Subunit: 225 residues, 3 copies
């Protein structure tokens, strides 16, 4: 749905690459899969937004009013740029599917929610594929599998399926350092409980955002000129 | 007794009037002293008991060590640098917005003892002091902007109250500045003096000083060696 | 059975006598091994329940990764460089003061299994082991200087006992040096072997080892592949 994006931000999605400066521009103020865990965080009791929730909320609003986002995990990111291709190939070789690239996908025209898949699979699944920074974390995944994977990571996988209207996702790891056994993955199925969470909470988050922008005099989208 | 430039100059060789925030002198003048930025640690209390809390012990060791080494390490240089860089920008936008005039004030000691002090971001024409933060992250600016007072963390309140205790003023402005903000990059509030804090300082601080004196003697140092 | 240079040489290709702390081999020899500095993690317990604590599972993963990759990431680099810079001056000063003469002892295994080791700061004329740190912050230095024994972090204690467990000794020196102190930049104590602790390693360690073993087999590895 390029025309929309284009009309909206003057950017041509096709030309984009994970890391592209545009890539980044397109994510500004947007609720993404990597960060949604924060949005759904709940107080043990009470209705009060947890801290990690207020904090994400505050981060998002600033992206809107400043038009920038600070950089994080430089070396981690770099590690990943470094090995993604090898990881991809192998994964394929091994999983038996062909993977193809996916720009960035928004849920709808509002452009308030999105995900950036690591790939789109021949069998119809999306792909999340990490090159953990510490071999310690690969071990953790490799041995514990599913129940090893973190909540923050489960929310991520689920939110991608919510945005793309998909039913299953691969969650894989790669570590070029392992003498053998360097690639591990699993398949995750869409879970309606998560679905229902998003449907309920995400829209509520968006409305508060707008209220706040209004209080201080901005409007969602200014970040895109 | 009342602190004078004359006293600082003779004890440390430094000319207060030439000092500028972040200067080398500015740093030296703070070695070993209980500052508003850190007092929060001094007044910390255990849930029950009388035992000094970890944060408290910890700042105690820190202060002592400044006395016996005469130096202090740097932390989060980046944020430090950030705050140091945007300060002037912040001051002048505050003057415009509040309408008051601001004067600069290095460091101010509570008395001739040189044990307690603060470094205001300015002194206002209406008699109030000024504290200007340039949060390193915009997220923080947004937090305050939207949350105001109640947004401001305890440490900040103690810092603001101690500045008033040291200088004997009745109110203080607290502001935030973010140069990255397209517009509206300055927000601020006014904090009034609070006796409950005054009192606490009055009781606790003096005691903290004595403990320090005891520990230094024990390893044969005397307060002040840092300005040698 | 006891460890000997021949084993090492035969199993890994390395000349143990030739090893220097921080040597490439020095590092090689530590891969997959449970050391004195990390043991605190293995001994860690949950307030209740028999479930491993987060730090335990973590170290546990870290070590397995060491076995399957044959490498280890670089860590706490600033702290290591600092200690590296002062270890000499610290030793010399300790010697003078304690009277003892100190000798280098690369690394030592508890046994031929090569699963357990330590790398003492030195070996003392009086047959005591030596742990000599250059704390990164002067604050920690002060902490110990003033509070001695009861001030030493659990982890440091574990590291100490682990070392006696490994070498089979009765006492060890725990000392600190701070080149920053204008005076009194050296302080130390003498720690006695504690049986409650020995029992502990004696019990836990072995189970930890069994578990690594299960886990590795589950993914087709066997301990020692790191030295291939």
């Amino acid at each position: 749905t390029p025309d929309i994006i284009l009309q909206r931000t003057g950017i041509d999605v096709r030309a984009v690459e994970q890391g592209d400066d545009a890539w980044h521009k397109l994510r500004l103020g947007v609720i993404t899969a990597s960060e949604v865990h924060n949005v759904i965080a709940k107080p043990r009791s009470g209705k009060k937004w947890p801290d990690m929730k207020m904090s994400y909320f505050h981060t998002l609003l600033a992206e809107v009013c400043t038009g920038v986002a600070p950089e994080v995990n430089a070396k981690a990111l770099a590690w990943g740029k470094q090995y993604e291709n090898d990881a991809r190939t192998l994964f394929e070789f091994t999983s038996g599917v062909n993977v193809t690239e996916s720009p960035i996908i928004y849920r709808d025209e509002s452009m308030r929610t999105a995900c950036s898949p690591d790939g789109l699979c021949s069998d119809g699944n999306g792909l999340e594929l990490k090159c953990p920074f510490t071999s310690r974390d690969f071990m953790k995944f490799r041995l514990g599998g599913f129940e090893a994977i973190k909540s923050a990571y489960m929310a991520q996988v689920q939110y991608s399926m919510w945005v793309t209207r998909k039913n299953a996702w691969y969650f894989a790891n790669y570590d070029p350092r392992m003498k053998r056994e360097g690639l591990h993955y699993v398949v995750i199925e869409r879970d309606e409980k998560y679905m229902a969470s998003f449907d309920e909470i995400v829209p509520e988050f968006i409305e508060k955002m707008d209220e706040a922008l209004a209080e201080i005099g901005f409007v969602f989208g200014e970040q895109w000129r």
